[PDB]
């Protein structure tokens, strides 16, 4: 789940 | 000659 | 005990110690590419070796 | 143990085991001279000296440990 | 091929569908050509400082020549400063004229590997190697590997696609010198993608089967995994210390790109296990 | 519990008897009950059991069962048992037609292994 | 003395290579030197890697010569033969004469093992006695070779990791020290530790069981595993049973059955294999087919 | 297409 | 008394495009130390004497 | 009965597959017959593709294959000249003379025993001799007395100055060492060369 | 009832040496096989296969072995506590 966006970063809403 | 393995 | 790992087919086998050697082994296999290709390095035998069966499979 | 009077009787099992091991080695020895196996000769001498000092044996059977040095292996075994 | 693709990139407007067709074909058959980092390093900056600097220092810069570079660079332990002069003018030179200078630098990196050289000279060599990488990559890779073999059989292009761990067969001096290690990392990543392409072509050629695709997947997975393992063993500190930080940073960058490209490889590397001395620094890095 | 069925051959019988491994418990009553249940199932399938019609001596299925044990104490997941209590709950229907789980054509012989340590 | 004896020994080696048997006096002298050179070595004759290890031979001299061609000449490559090289071979006396000549020439570049067939009763009832009576006329060569087989060693150890032997394991024995304490100066009994050493065989069974050969027992996977953990051995290489591919691995890679006498009794048509252990202890298999005649 | 250890 | 970096630095059996020579290993191989204990027998006599005197 | 060029051209499509295949017999016959093809096809074709096959035959499994390949490279060096082999073949053997397999060490020793006889004396004294004497200190007794036999074979080709300078300390060391086999062979080589 | 629980605290695979009863050893073997504890099961099998106790001996050896194991076990607890 999201290998490149890091866990402590905001989600993308849509 | 009947057997190859030496069953004895 | 009845695991029988497929080192050639699966990559999650081949632990770290033998890794380079198996890598060269699959490469040699795939770049040899004869009529018959093999998926197991050590297929010696299972329980018994029959002379009658060998002569029957032979001509 | 040898200085003790009954401790030989209580260590009889160890004595029996060492005697059996020495018997096996002296049977399995091929060399005509005894002194080719240095540890075995010393061990046999010491063991016979132990029972001799622990008074299970006559003093001639004590001096068996003396004559070990120049006896041949089959003589020692018998 | 790469240089012509760059020219098509420039002249996209005139060519109707050719740029599309060629870029599709390279992305189909030459991924080690169409890696992303070389192209962004091509895109560069439009601060134009390179262009102004070139237009106002190249002039008539007393005609530096490959033979003059070879003389000074064979007498480099007697003369470092003339060499650094020449390669300064070489960095001022452009991408096309750099080609006659490809022979010297690669074939003579050994005295660079010798200790005592300044890393201004090393980083100048590194930047020139990037520029030659964006112009003519394949022969550059061949000369670089055949000159970075330790002190000598001569590898070929097909042999390098067959076995890219030959790139990692180099000096422990290479391992502990930072920018040359970056050159080695680029060659390693490129030849891994090249090996995927070459096994693809060889299997599709040899068809004249389902086990063959699974054998391809197994060989590639174990292949880049073993490459990762060798890189981590490089990150291990040697017994002699008992530069290293920059080397670990570069290997962490390359591992980051491999993990982003394929997280299966993270799974396989972690199932194989690596030294737990390497574990915390890799945790901090990747 | 059953290894070799009546349709099995000598090769499979050899393979199973030799590849048996020691992991079980001394559940002699349960094992004997299963064996004699198999025997009675075979007998009533054959249907030679003339229940209510005498007992024909010419209808026989002579079976000899050899039980091999060491003569140690009985073991159960509840605990130890001092008596060979044959279990009374019989899921096999028709076992109530005979008071005993065996018949007159089955002979049981027990081998008890008492070889000394030395 | 020693130099001229060594030169005449090399002459005998050349003649044996040229497939001609020696004289009775030469046989007597060779057996004498063999007694004096085999008495010293123990029951676990330690052989040091690198080495080329070889299974049964059974007097097939031409296949033995092809095996020499496969694995190198006796002065160069260390060899280890694991028994059964006296019975129902046609040039069997030439074969055993070559083997003992090589041993007394290079005591430590080669070592041979004693199989079950190298005993008086077995030789008498399987025809080596008939062969030597046909060849030399009398039984002096026969009694010389059987007296020598009374002095042949028992088991081979390779680097404390490989346990080489002919038959296999035994419930009588637990340890290499018990193997050492055994005395081998006796023709093999029909019951006992030397007996089931030279008559055992593997199986996928578990536990023990009586062999169909009438002598010795047959071991199981867990038995071999227990033995190897007991004495620290990593792999047991045995050679008594005929196989078709030339080798077999049993007990999840703990027992290696080796056979290196191809086309058993000239009719079975089996292949043959030998192992070679390289000095960093790396194993390789060499397989071959019998030479044209 | 192998995502884990084969027996498990 | 009683490695992968080095392996690929010298690996692949001088053929390169074929198989490696050996077909595997058999364990760790070559039990390394083989170390003999040869500290002293002298004053080990005396340690024996001290213990024996305590027993006496 | 058939001309060499005609049969070589007819067989050159099938030589490469037959060069590396199942039987050591067919490999042996190919090794025995190929130097005629090399002499027919000249230096260039043999250098282009058969050189790798010769090296693979040298590192091949069977001892018969190894000795046949050594005799074959004797035929090639006497057909193609000493300096060309000095340019190409000598670095190959002297580079594989350091690998962990003592079998390939034995291969190199046999090849040097041939190439010292064929290759004159200068290349023997300045190329092969230092490598052989630096393999004389190998821990393996087998390759130690094989180097002793190598010096026994090679000694009459040298000059007496090089022998008495460097061969003599190596020979007396190979007598002084503990193993009886290498000591006896070193004694035999010493009394053959009559250095003492 | 005591060996049923898995929440033990007292070195099962070390006191399998001290136990000397064939029935409790048999129960241990069955439970270890049932819960898939192969190495402890192997330890228990070898402890059973000790020739010291066979439940068919002339009972002098059995009483001597039981006394020896009693002495060693009691000294083990005496070392543990206090
Ligand atoms: Mn045999
Ligand atoms: Mn045998």
Residue G71: which domain range? 6-288
What distance in angstroms lies between residue G197's CA and the mean position of ligand 2's atoms?
10
G188 DSSP 8-state letter? P
Q: Tell me how long chain E is.
A: 286
How close is the nearest chain E Cα to the Cα of H5, in Å? Answer: 9
Residue G25 lies in a domain: yes
The answer to whether the Cβ–Cβ distance between C47 and G204 falls below 8 Å is yes
In order of F23, F33, F64, F72, the CA distances from F20 in angstroms are 9, 20, 21, 20
Helix (H, G, I), strand (E, B) or coil at G165: strand
Contact list in C for residue G241 (CB cut-off 8 A) is: 49
SS3 E285: helix
- Do E and K touch, 3+ Cβ pairs within 8 Å? The answer is no
d(CA F109, CA C15): 54
Say how many domains are in chain G: 1
Cβ atoms of J106 and G76 closer than 8 Å: yes
CB J146 within 8 A of CB G285: no
Question: Is some CB atom of chain C closer than 8 A to the CB atom of I7?
Answer: yes
At residue E193, φ and ψ (nearest 5 deg) are: -65, -35
Cα four-point dihedral sign J90, J95, J98, J104: negative
Q: Give dist(CA E122, CA E177) in Å, integer.
A: 9
Q: What are the tokens at D71?
A: 């006896």
| G32 in any annotated domain | yes
Domain for residue G104, yes or no? Answer: yes
* Residue J180 phi, psi (nearest 5): -65, -35
3-state secondary structure of F102: coil
User: Residue I11: closest CA among chain E residues belongs to which residue?
Assistant: E169
Q: Is D25 part of the contact surface with chain G (CB cutoff 8 Å)? A: yes
Question: Looking up tokens 């058939």, which residue turns up?
Answer: J2
Q: Is G56 helix (H, G, I), strand (E, B) or coil?
A: coil
Rounded to the nearest angstrom, the gap between the alpha carbon of residue I12 and the centroid of all alpha carbons in its chain is 27
Contact J106 G109 (CB under 8 A): no
CB atoms within 10 A of CB G26: 17
Contact K23 F115 (CB under 8 A): no
Distances (CA, A) of G204 to C41, F22, G253, G254, G255: 21, 15, 12, 12, 11
Reading the block at residue G232, the tokens are 């620290």
Rounded to 5 degrees, φ, ψ at K54 are -140, 0
- Give the separation between CA E180 and CA E170, rounded to whole angstroms: 11
How large is the C-alpha radius of gyration of chain E? 21
Task: Name the active-site residue from G117, G178, G229, G251.
Answer: G117
Compute the half-sphere exposure of residue D37: CA atoms within 13 Å on the CB side of its CA: 20
Look at residue G97 and tell me if it is in a domain. Answer: yes
Q: Six-digit token pair at D44?
A: 């046999």
Instruction: Show the tokens assigned to I53.
Output: 């005197």
Between G281, G284, G285, which is nearest I29 by CB? G281
Give the environment of ion ligand 1: residues with CB less than 5 A. Answer: G 56, 84, 117
Q: Residue G78: phi, psi to the nearest 5? A: -70, 140
CA atoms in the 13 A half-sphere facing the CB of E60: 0
Burial class (CB in 10 A: 0-12, 13-18, 19+), G63: buried
Cβ-contact G175, G66 below 8 angstroms? no
I4 interaction partners in chain C (CB closer than 8 Å): 16, 19-20
Contact in structure between G202 and G251 (CB atoms under 8 Å): yes
| Residues facing residue F109 across a β-bridge | F66
The secondary structure of residue F108, as a DSSP letter, is E
- Say if CB J30 and CB J18 are below 8 A apart: yes
- C-alpha distance from residue G78 to each of G212, I13, J175 (Å): 35, 22, 21
Choose among C3, C9, C11: nearest Cβ to H7: C3
Is chain G touching chain A, with at least 3 CB–CB pairs below 8 Å? Answer: no
- The angstrom resolution of this structure is 4.6
Chains E and H touch (3+ CB pairs under 8 A): yes
Q: Which residues contact E126 (CB under 8 A, 6 or more apart)?
A: E179, E180, E182, E183
In three-state secondary structure terms, E120 is helix
DSSP string, chain J: ---HHHHHHHHHHHHHHHHSSS-HHHHHHHHHHHHHHHHHHHHHHIIIIIHHHHHHHHT-S-HHHHHHHHHHHHHHHHHH-HHHHHHTHHHHHHHHTTSS-HHHHHHHHHHHHHHHHHSTTHHIIIIIHHHHHHHTT-S-HHHHHHHHHHHHHHGGGS-HHHIIIIIHHHHHHHHHSS-HHHHHHHHHHHHHHT--
Q: Which ligand is nearest to the CA of G60?
A: 1
Q: Where are the alpha helices (DSSP H) in F1-118?
A: 10-18, 28-46
Q: Dump strand ranges (E) for chain G.
A: 44-47, 51-54, 79-81, 110-112, 155-158, 162-165, 235-238, 247-250, 255-258, 272-278, 282-288
In whole angstroms, what is the distance from residue I18 CA to residue C25 CA? 8
- Is there a contact between J175 and J183 (Cβ–Cβ < 8 Å)? yes
Cβ pair J32, J72 in contact under 8 A: yes
Q: Are E223 and E197 in contact (CB under 8 A)?
A: no
The CA distance from D62 to D56, in Å, is 10
Cβ atoms of residues G52 and G78 within 8 Å: yes
Residues making up chain G, counted from first to last? 293
Rounded Cα distance, E47 and E55, in Å: 14
Distance G84 CA to ligand 2 centre (A): 5
Q: Which of C20, C25, C31 sits opposite I4 (nearest CB)?
A: C20
G238 CA distance to ligand 2 middle (Å): 9
Q: How would you class J160 by CB atoms within 10 Å of its CB: exposed for 0-12, middle for 13-18, buried for 19 or more? A: exposed
Residue D39 touches chain G, beta carbons under 8 Å: no
Torsion over CA: J40, J44, J49, J51 (sign): positive
Whether residue G190 is annotated as binding a ligand: the answer is no
Strands F106-112 and G79-81: unpaired
Those residues whose C-beta lies under 8 Å from the C-beta of residue J88, and which sit 6 or more positions away, are J47, J51
* Strand duo G79-81 + G235-238: pairing: unpaired
Sign of the dihedral through C-alpha E241, E243, E246, E250: negative
Order across the sheet with G255-258: list the strands: G44-47, G155-158, G162-165, G235-238, G255-258, G247-250
Calculate how close chain C gets to I19, using CA atoms only, in Å. Answer: 5
Which residues neighbour G148 within 8 Å (Cβ) at sequence distance 6 or greater? G31, G34, G35, G38, G100
Gap between the Cα atoms of E90 and E102, Å rounded: 11
Residue G159 included in any domain: yes
- Identify the closest residue of chain C to E195 by CA–CA distance: C27
CB contact C48 to G (< 8 Å): no
Q: Give the Cα separation of D21 and D2 in Å (integer).
A: 20
Question: What are the distances in angstroms from CA J34 to CA J49, J50, J66, J86, K3?
Answer: 13, 9, 15, 21, 77
CA–CA dist D4, I55 (Å, integer): 13
Number of the ligand closest to the Cα of G261: 1
- Surrounding ion ligand 2 within 5 Å at CB are G 84, 115-116, 166, 240
Residues pairing with G79 in the sheet: G52, G110
> Is D28 near chain G, with CB under 8 Å?
yes
Question: Which ligand approaches the C-alpha of residue G86 most closely?
Answer: 1
Chain G residue numbers with beta carbons less than 8 Å from the beta carbon of D27 are 183
Which positions 1-8 of H are in contact with C (Cβ < 8 Å)?
2, 4-7
Region class of G84: left (phi > 0), else alpha (psi between -120 and 50), else beta: left
Stated as kind and residue range, the H or E segment containing G198 is helix G193-199
Chain H residues closer than 8 Å to C5 by CB: 6-7
How far apart CA G42 and CA D31 sit, in angstroms, is 12
d(C-alpha F74, C-alpha I28), whole Å: 47
- Residue G150 is assigned to a structural domain of this protein: yes
G293 assigned to some structural domain: no
d(CA J133, CA J109) in angstroms, rounded, equals 11
J194: left (phi over 0), alpha (psi -120 to 50) or beta: left
Q: How far apart are CA E79 and CA C39, in angstroms?
A: 59
F109 membership: H or E segment, kind and range = strand F106-112
CATH of the domain at G162: 3.60.21.10
The reply to whether A7 touches chain E by the CB within 8 Å rule is no
Beta bridge pairs of residue F75: F80
Q: How many CB pairs under 8 A join G and J?
A: 41
Inter-chain CB proximity G203 and F18 less than 8 Å: yes
Residue G79 forms part of a structural domain: yes
Across the beta sheet with G282-288, the strand order is: G110-112, G79-81, G51-54, G272-278, G282-288
- Bridge partners (DSSP) of residue G162 are G158, G235
**G58 marked among binding-site residues:** yes
How far apart are the CA of G215 and the centre of ligand 1, in A?
A: 14
Report the helix count and the strand count for chain I, using DSSP H and E.
Answer: 2, 0
* Per-residue exposure over K30-52, b if at least 16 CB sit within 10 Å of its own CB, e if not: bbbbeeebeebbbbbbebbeeeb
Do G196 and G215 meet the contact criterion of CB atoms below 8 Å apart?
yes
Contact G216, G242 (CB under 8 A): no
CA nearest to G185 within chain D: D28
Q: How many whole angstroms from G58 Cα to the centroid of ligand 1?
A: 6
Q: Is the dihedral of CA F100, F101, F102, F104 positive or negative?
A: positive
Nearest ligand to the CA atom of G165: 2
Query: CA–CA separation, J6 vs J40, rounded Å?
Result: 10
The verdict on a CB contact (< 8 Å) between C12 and H2 is: yes
Q: Which long-range contacts (CB under 8 A, 24 or more apart) does G265-268 make?
A: G265/B1, G265/B4, G265/G88, G267/B4, G268/B4, G268/C51, G268/C54, G268/C55, G268/G242
Strand G79-81 with G51-54, pairing:
parallel
Q: What are phi and psi of D23, to 5 degrees?
A: -60, -45
How far apart are the CA of C48 and the centre of ligand 1, in A? 17
Prior bond to G177 cis, omega within 30? no
The answer to whether the CB of E167 falls within 8 A of the CB of E188 is yes
Residues in a beta bridge with G100: none
With CB atoms and an 8 Å threshold, state whether I14 touches J96.
yes
The crossing angle, in degrees rounded to 10, of helices J102-118 and J63-80 is 30
| Catalytic residue list contains G190 | no
d(CA E247, CA E233): 12
Subunits with 3+ C-beta pairs closer than 8 A to K? F
G84 labelled binding-site residue:
yes
Nearest to E65, CA basis, from E120, E106, E103: E103
Q: What is the dihedral angle through the alpha carbons of E133, E136, E141, E147, rounded to the nearest 10 degrees?
A: -100
Residues of C in contact with I17 (CB under 8 A): 31
Pairing of strands G162-165, G155-158: antiparallel
- The ligand that comes nearest to the alpha carbon of residue G59 is 1
């Amino acid at each position: 789940t999201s290998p490149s966006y890091s866990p402590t970063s905001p989600s993308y809403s849509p | 000659s009947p057997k190859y393995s030496p069953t004895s | 005990k009845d695991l029988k790992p497929q080192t050639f087919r699966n990559a999650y086998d081949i632990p770290r110690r033998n890794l380079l050697d198996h890598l060269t082994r699959m490469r040699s296999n795939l770049l040899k590419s004869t009529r018959r290709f093999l998926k197991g390095q050590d297929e010696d035998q299972v329980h018994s070796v029959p002379i009658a069966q060998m002569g029957n499979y032979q001509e | 143990v040898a200085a003790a009077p009954p401790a030989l009787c209580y260590c009889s099992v160890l004595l029996r085991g060492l005697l059996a091991a020495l018997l096996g080695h002296w049977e399995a020895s091929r060399h005509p001279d005894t002194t080719h196996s240095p540890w075995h000769l010393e061990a046999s001498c010491t063991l016979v000296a132990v029972m001799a000092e622990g008074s299970l044996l006559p003093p001639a059977l004590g001096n068996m440990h003396e004559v070990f040095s120049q006896l041949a292996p089959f003589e020692v075994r018998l | 091929i790469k240089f012509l693709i760059r020219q098509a990139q420039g002249l996209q407007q005139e060519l109707g569908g050719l740029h599309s067709a060629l870029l599709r074909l390279l992305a189909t058959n030459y991924p080690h050509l169409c890696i992303v980092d070389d192209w962004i390093c091509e895109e560069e900056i439009t601060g134009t400082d390179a262009l102004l600097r070139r237009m106002l220092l190249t002039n008539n810069a007393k005609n530096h020549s490959p033979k003059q570079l070879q003389e000074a660079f064979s007498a480099v332990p007697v003369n470092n400063t003339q060499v650094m002069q020449i390669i300064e003018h070489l960095t001022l030179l452009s991408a096309s004229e750099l080609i006659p200078y490809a022979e010297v630098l690669t074939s003579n990196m050994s005295q660079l590997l010798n200790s005592g050289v300044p890393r201004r000279i090393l980083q100048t060599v590194n930047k020139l190697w990037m520029v030659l990488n964006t112009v003519m990559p394949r022969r550059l890779w061949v000369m670089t590997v055949n000159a970075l073999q330790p002190s000598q059989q001569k590898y070929t292009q097909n042999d390098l696609m067959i076995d890219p761990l030959i790139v990692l067969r180099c000096d422990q001096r290479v391992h502990r010198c930072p920018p040359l290690m970056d050159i080695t990392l680029h060659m390693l990543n490129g030849y891994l993608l090249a090996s995927k392409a070459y096994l693809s072509a060889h299997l599709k050629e040899t068809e004249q089967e389902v086990t063959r695709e699974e054998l391809k997947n197994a060989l590639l997975a174990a292949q880049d995994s073993a490459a990762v393992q060798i890189l981590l063993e490089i990150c291990l500190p040697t017994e002699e210390e008992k530069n290293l930080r920059e080397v670990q940073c570069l290997i962490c960058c390359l591992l980051h790109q491999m993990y982003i490209a394929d997280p299966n490889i993270a799974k396989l590397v972690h199932f194989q296990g690596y030294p737990c001395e390497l574990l915390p620094l890799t945790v901090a890095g990747i | 519990a059953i290894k070799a069925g009546w349709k099995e051959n000598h090769a499979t019988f050899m393979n199973e008897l030799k590849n048996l491994q020691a992991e079980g418990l001394t559940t002699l009553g349960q094992s004997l009950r299963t064996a004699f249940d198999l025997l009675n199932l075979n007998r009533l399938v054959t249907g030679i059991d003339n229940y209510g019609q005498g007992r024909n001596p010419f209808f026989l299925e002579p079976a000899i069962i050899i039980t091999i044990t060491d003569g140690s104490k009985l073991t159960t997941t509840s605990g130890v048992q001092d008596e060979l209590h044959l279990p009374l709950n019989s899921p096999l229907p028709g076992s109530e037609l005979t008071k005993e789980p065996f018949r007159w054509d089955q002979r049981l012989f027990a081998l008890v292994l008492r070889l000394p340590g030395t | 003395d020693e130099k001229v004896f060594t030169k005449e020994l090399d002459q005998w080696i050349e003649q044996l290579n040229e497939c001609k048997q020696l004289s009775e006096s030469q046989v007597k002298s060779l057996c004498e030197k063999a007694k004096e050179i085999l008495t010293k070595e123990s029951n676990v004759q330690e052989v040091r890697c690198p080495v080329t290890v070889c299974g049964d031979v059974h007097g097939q001299f031409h296949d033995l010569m092809e095996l020499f061609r496969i694995g190198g000449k006796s002065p160069d490559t260390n060899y280890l033969f694991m028994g059964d090289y006296v019975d129902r071979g046609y040039y069997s006396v030439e074969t055993v004469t070559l083997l003992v000549a090589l041993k007394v020439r290079y005591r430590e570049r080669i070592t041979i093992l004693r199989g079950n067939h190298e005993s008086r009763q077995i030789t008498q009832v399987y025809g080596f006695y008939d062969e030597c009576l046909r060849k030399y006329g009398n039984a002096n060569v026969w009694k010389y070779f059987t007296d020598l087989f009374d002095y042949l060693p028992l088991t081979a150890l390779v680097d404390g990791q490989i346990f080489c032997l002919h038959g296999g394991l035994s419930p009588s024995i637990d340890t290499l020290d018990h193997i050492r304490a055994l005395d081998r100066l006796q023709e093999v009994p029909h019951e006992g530790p030397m007996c089931d050493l030279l008559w055992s065989d593997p199986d996928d069974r578990g536990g023990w069981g009586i062999s169909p050969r009438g002598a010795g027992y047959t071991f199981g996977q867990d038995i071999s595993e227990t033995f190897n953990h007991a004495n620290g051995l990593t792999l047991v290489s045995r050679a008594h049973q005929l196989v078709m591919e030339g080798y077999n691995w049993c007990h999840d890679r703990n027992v290696v059955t080796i056979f290196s006498a191809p086309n058993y009794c000239y009719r079975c048509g089996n292949q043959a294999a030998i192992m070679e252990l390289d000095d960093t202890l790396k194993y390789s298999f060499l397989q071959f087919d019998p030479a044209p005649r | 297409t192998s995502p884990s250890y084969s027996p498990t | 008394g009683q490695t992968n970096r080095r392996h690929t630095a010298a690996v692949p059996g001088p053929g390169g495009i074929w198989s490696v020579f050996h077909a595997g290993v058999i364990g760790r191989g070559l039990k390394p130390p083989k170390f003999v204990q040869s500290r002293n027998q002298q004053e080990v006599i005396y340690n024996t004497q001290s213990l024996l005197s305590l027993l006496v | 009965v058939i001309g060499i060029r005609q049969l070589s051209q007819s067989l050159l499509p099938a030589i490469v597959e037959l060069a590396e295949d199942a039987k050591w017999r067919v490999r042996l016959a190919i090794i025995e017959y190929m130097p005629l093809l090399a002499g027919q096809l000249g230096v260039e074709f043999f250098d282009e593709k058969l050189n790798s096959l010769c090296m693979a035959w040298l590192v091949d499994h069977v001892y018969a294959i190894r000795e046949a390949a050594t005799s074959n490279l004797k035929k090639l060096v006497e057909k193609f000249g000493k300096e060309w082999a000095h340019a190409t073949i000598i670095p190959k053997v002297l580079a594989m003379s350091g690998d962990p397999n003592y079998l390939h060490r034995m291969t190199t020793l046999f090849c040097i025993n041939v190439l010292s006889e064929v290759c004159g004396q200068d290349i023997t004294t300045k190329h092969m001799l230092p490598t052989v004497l630096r393999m004389a200190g190998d821990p393996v007794a087998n390759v130690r007395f094989n180097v002793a036999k190598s010096l026994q074979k090679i000694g009459p080709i040298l000059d007496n100055s090089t022998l008495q300078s460097e061969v003599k300390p190596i020979l007396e060391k190979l007598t002084q060492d503990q193993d009886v086999d290498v000591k006896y062979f070193a004694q035999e080589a010493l009394t053959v060369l009559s250095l003492a | 009832k005591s060996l049923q629980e898995q929440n033990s605290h007292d070195a099962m695979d070390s006191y399998y040496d001290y136990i000397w009863d064939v029935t409790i050893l048999e129960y241990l073997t069955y439970l270890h096989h049932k819960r898939g504890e192969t190495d402890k099961r192997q330890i228990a099998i070898k402890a059973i296969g000790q020739t010291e106790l066979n439940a068919s001996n002339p009972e002098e050896v059995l009483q001597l072995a039981a006394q020896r194991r009693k002495k060693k076990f009691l000294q083990a607890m005496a070392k543990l506590y206090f």
